[PDB]
Design a protein around this ligand. Structure first.
Ligand SMILES: [Ca+2]
Ligand SMILES: [Ca+2]
Ligand SMILES: [Ca+2]
Ligand SMILES: [Ca+2]
Ligand SMILES: [Ca+2]
Ligand SMILES: [Ca+2]
Ligand SMILES: [Ca+2]
Length: 308
């Protein structure tokens, strides 16, 4: 039913339309898959002798442009560029770096690592190492390797218990914190395993994993661990809370809102929407409506997929 050549045509027309027909441009790209958008972009370049992304960059502006260009990139290219941007210039955008490095799976990170080097001619790890220091750097480096254990069929009950005690002994039960021990367990073990480990941890500790983290560390490192545990325990809820934070207050933290909507639209948006509505009483759709306007809002609402 999909027709790249045709979509590339309608978009060329929309762009040509006096004043630029954004509604049409949004209606198409926000209602197509990422793979389909890739075909449309190929069909386009052939018809115009110019890259689709490049054409939309000249034709669009503001937050809408940000949404659209992000959508034209493959998942790995998007993440790679968002990562680069988080480290660009002196200083670092810790939140963004953390959000991506903590939430992506091995398969995603492997591709990201590959695409990153091709795009920027340097390894993601090298840039991370240059932009970070201390335990925070250690954690971000280990997670970025994308070498976490795969979901096994056999539940390792003995390991689950030892990991829990180790986590407990490394923090709550000692002066200071054996951060390396925490980094090792939380980056190497499979997600299903760690979910069980965190439950077993509650059998030994009066405070769960998240609260333990708040008690033991601070700064970027504390932020990384909290984000990571959330992604392990309930990723869809993790994104729902970040979505809530980017819109709850004055204005909007557009960069966060956009990245999540673009990067999770084809992954688990349905679950994010469900967790969001359950926790906040109103739909994700509703919050986007109150915080954004114009073609930008319409674009985000399409990526949302519907109201709840
Ligand atoms: Ca217009
Ligand atoms: Ca522009
Ligand atoms: Ca930097
Ligand atoms: Ca900073
Ligand atoms: Ca301690
Ligand atoms: Ca703290
Ligand atoms: Ca707001």
């Amino acid at each position: 039913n999909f027709d790249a050549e045709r979509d590339a045509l309608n978009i060329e027309t929309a762009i040509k339309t006096k004043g630029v027909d954004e509604v049409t441009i949004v209606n198409i790209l926000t209602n197509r898959s990422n793979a389909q958008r890739q075909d449309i972009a190929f069909a386009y370049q052939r018809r115009t002798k110019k890259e689709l992304a490049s054409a939309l960059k000249s034709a669009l502006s503001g937050h809408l442009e940000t949404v659209i260009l992000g959508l034209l990139k493959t998942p790995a290219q998007y993440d790679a560029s968002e990562l680069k941007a988080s480290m660009k210039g002196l200083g670092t955008d810790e939140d963004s770096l953390i959000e991506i490095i903590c939430s992506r799976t091995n398969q995603e990170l492997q591709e990201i690592n590959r695409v990153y080097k091709e795009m920027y001619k340097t390894d993601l790890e090298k840039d991370i190492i240059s932009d970070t220091s201390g335990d925070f750097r250690k954690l971000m480096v280990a997670l970025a390797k994308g070498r976490r254990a795969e979901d096994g069929s056999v539940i390792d009950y003995e390991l689950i218990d030892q990991d829990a005690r180790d986590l407990y002994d490394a923090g709550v039960k000692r002066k200071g914190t054996d951060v390396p021990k925490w980094i090792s367990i939380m980056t190497e073990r499979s997600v299903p395993h760690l979910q069980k480990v965190f439950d077993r941890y509650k059998s030994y500790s009066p405070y769960d994993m998240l609260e333990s983290i708040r008690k033991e560390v601070k700064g970027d490192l504390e932020n990384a661990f909290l984000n990571l545990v959330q992604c392990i325990q309930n990723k869809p809820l993790y994104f729902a809370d970040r979505l809530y934070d980017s819109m709850k207050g004055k204005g909007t933290r557009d960069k966060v809102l956009i990245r999540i909507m673009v990067s999770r639209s084809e992954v688990d948006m349905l679950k994010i929407r469900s967790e969001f509505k359950r926790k906040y009483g109103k739909s994700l759709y509703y919050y986007i409506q109150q915080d954004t306007k114009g073609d930008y809002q319409k674009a985000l609402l399409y990526l949302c997929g519907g109201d709840d």
